[PDB]
Ligand binder design. Sequence first.
Ligand SMILES: C[C@H](O)COCC(COC[C@@H](C)O)(COC[C@@H](C)O)COC[C@@H](C)O
Ligand SMILES: C[C@H](O)COCC(COC[C@@H](C)O)(COC[C@@H](C)O)COC[C@@H](C)O
Ligand SMILES: N[P@]1(=O)C=CNC(=O)N1
Ligand SMILES: N[P@]1(=O)C=CNC(=O)N1
Ligand SMILES: [Zn+2]
Ligand SMILES: [Zn+2]
Ligand SMILES: [Zn+2]
Ligand SMILES: [Zn+2]
Lengths: 422, 422
Amino acid sequence: ALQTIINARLPGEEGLWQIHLQDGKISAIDAQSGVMPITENSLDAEQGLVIPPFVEPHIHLDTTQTAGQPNWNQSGTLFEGIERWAERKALLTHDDVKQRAWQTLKWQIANGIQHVRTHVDVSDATLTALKAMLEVKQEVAPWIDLQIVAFPQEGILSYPNGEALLEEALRLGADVVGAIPHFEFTREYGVESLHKTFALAQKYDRLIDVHCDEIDDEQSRFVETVAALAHHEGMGARVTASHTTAMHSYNGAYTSRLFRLLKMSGINFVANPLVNIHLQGRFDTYPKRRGITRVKEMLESGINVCFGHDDVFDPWYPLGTANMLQVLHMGLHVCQLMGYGQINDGLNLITHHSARTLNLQDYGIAAGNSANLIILPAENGFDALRRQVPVRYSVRGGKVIASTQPAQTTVYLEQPEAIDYK
Amino acid sequence: ALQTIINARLPGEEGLWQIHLQDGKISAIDAQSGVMPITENSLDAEQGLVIPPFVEPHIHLDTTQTAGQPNWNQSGTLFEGIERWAERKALLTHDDVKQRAWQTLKWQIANGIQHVRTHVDVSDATLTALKAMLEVKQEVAPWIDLQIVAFPQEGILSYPNGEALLEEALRLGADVVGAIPHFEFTREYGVESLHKTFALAQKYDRLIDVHCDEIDDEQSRFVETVAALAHHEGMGARVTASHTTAMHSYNGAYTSRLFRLLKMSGINFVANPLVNIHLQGRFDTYPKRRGITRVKEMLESGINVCFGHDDVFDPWYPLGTANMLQVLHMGLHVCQLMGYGQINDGLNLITHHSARTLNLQDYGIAAGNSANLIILPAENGFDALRRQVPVRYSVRGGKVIASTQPAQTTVYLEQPEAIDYK
Ligand SMILES: C[C@H](O)COCC(COC[C@@H](C)O)(COC[C@@H](C)O)COC[C@@H](C)O
Ligand SMILES: C[C@H](O)COCC(COC[C@@H](C)O)(COC[C@@H](C)O)COC[C@@H](C)O
Ligand SMILES: N[P@]1(=O)C=CNC(=O)N1
Ligand SMILES: N[P@]1(=O)C=CNC(=O)N1
Ligand SMILES: [Zn+2]
Ligand SMILES: [Zn+2]
Ligand SMILES: [Zn+2]
Ligand SMILES: [Zn+2]
């Protein structure tokens, strides 16, 4: 029964802090006069940084851990990835999906992630993975709040009974409506698919998260429809456009015009740096574009943007340990957000901005909130990112649900010396 | 007195292996029939991967740890970096250089790096850093074999007494002659500077490592002169072209013509992914080029290419823990070397290929070689790279010089569970 977290640093605050817990909530946050001694019912943050939990705003738990089954994505493209997945989707079972999803979820718990939005492919007359994931959501609830997106991987209009399958997924309980307009057979299907998506979200009162313009095509502008529909319906906060990698290739004048709408609409954006750097630029020879959306410009304009991992060992990404600091590291480099302050503030892109994207209400280190928080063995955001630190403790509802004993490195010179990389 | 390494995996080999040590050398390597029990005078590799030590073919130890002093590189460009460094170079002292260099060298020892090539700026009438680094080379020799490049940061022809200073650095003992032709005032100075560099290397019998075409300028083609001069003198193995980021922007026909010469010349290439992704593409708006040299194509052509870290917390790079697996991770992503086999073989880009670049003779796990080797807590190269593992043990001359006790992660679900991310 934890009553207190002691010796904690807080981003943008001086000195150490004590965090009081009561009935699974944060009751008070008080400055310390100095380093406090450990007491019973206290958790020692050891002068580490305390932040709300990491968020994964974009992952595919139904595809996770399937890379190479039955074939590998040779070209490393989005489009071959979808073909490889279709082969694997034909082999899906209820137990297979739950086993793989739980494998990745456990890594996420270990990595201080307590909020996860997973897309699940509902281009499947059996809805096997969707129904299994609805179960996983209930099973993992003590540790992770899981959102499920009904994601029509093969299109709403371009796949047999796609719209009916999408609606059935919502009826069954999916939290978010997805779409994939750039993968529809025609631009017209793409636009119409978004109208159907927004109509479904309003009918069932659900969130929207579109795989939007994930393609190096300067003519792929489905994002303007997503934002306009959100604005018309006054539902900006409930709407996310994921990827928008085509925006990397837009001319500047169109982008400037578009940004007015993006700001007015209030929609959210997700960039997925690990996967984007791998899948984008694949049709260039040299020079090769980076292919990540306009993260720097969005931040400058006060548009909410955040980072997801997207894929863990699957047809679209052969790596991953589901680590958000690793995602952030890649994102800061590729987006050239490399000023000291930008790097230090980077934690926001995998915490607060992502919580906003998921429309979370109970999130942040503040009195009255659930005691959901993590402790990093680092002095600040810059230090955590630079040293790629693990999560020392993850606390949920005032209980410890994960812990890492950090590695210990020693060099043997004229005498043994501990190395902290500081 | 270690006599044996037991329970070791070797890249591309089946089962476990025993490595016998004698007089600081590898005496024999024998297959094991099974897991062996720990014995006195034995080091247990614990079924980890054993490889020769990591190599850092390109770092700046004279600039390391100076980021923000006295000013920050605001634009994140090569050119502003040089201006910021010039301000800091004016404040250099003998003790300052040795203290900062040793700080980074210790991180490198901790990271299993036993071979390091450092560039040192010799555009300095006092040669302060160069002379200090010659001392550091002797001091660190029990742990790292350090090569020093006399690097004329501000040009050979474009800096007062540049050529005389470069020659004095060689007379004093620098192992390698540097140059920076794309930073010289004119293309003609650039070409002439390479002639002077090669003349000096032949006069003193030294290696050559040129900062070559580190610029997003499709007309920057100094690499062809470096290769042609190497070919003419028959000295390919002794010559390295670092960066060659302009090659990212060459047309394909010129590149094809050039590659014939690059192969015939036998020169080495260094790409520096962490720094290249940060400094290159800075003059693009959108789309933005990646800016790394043609690593994939070089590998396909049998041209020796490897990865360096380049900078650790300095005017050109505000991050770093001097970790080669992190460099490799960035390189595989940006160069799109993301096939399973390519990732698994990635260790070569920070071991064997780099040893060739430094012209090393005593390197590799083979009988007769010095017992210089490291142990990774991983099953193979792919696993090591994916999980970004630390170095479990670093062995040099048959003695342990560094060790890391790996982190331990536990999640508390219905019962405590250990997480290995596998
Ligand atoms: C390691 C991992 O991949 C498997 O864990 C088993 C697990 C068992 O589910 C129990 C459920 C809540 O009723 C989840 O992890 C353990 C609990 C305590 O969190 C999921 O197994 C899926 C099968 C049964 O298809
Ligand atoms: C932590 C680091 O930044 C400082 O270490 C001190 C160190 C002392 O050098 C001793 C020499 C071999 O004669 C090197 O590390 C310890 C030895 C045992 O390896 C270098 O200090 C530089 C000063 C003296 O300008
Ligand atoms: N890269 P990603 O987000 C993963 C799966 N399917 C997609 O269409 N895109
Ligand atoms: N990026 P880099 O290799 C580091 C220092 N000075 C340079 O000119 N280039
Ligand atoms: Zn079931
Ligand atoms: Zn996705
Ligand atoms: Zn001295
Ligand atoms: Zn350099």
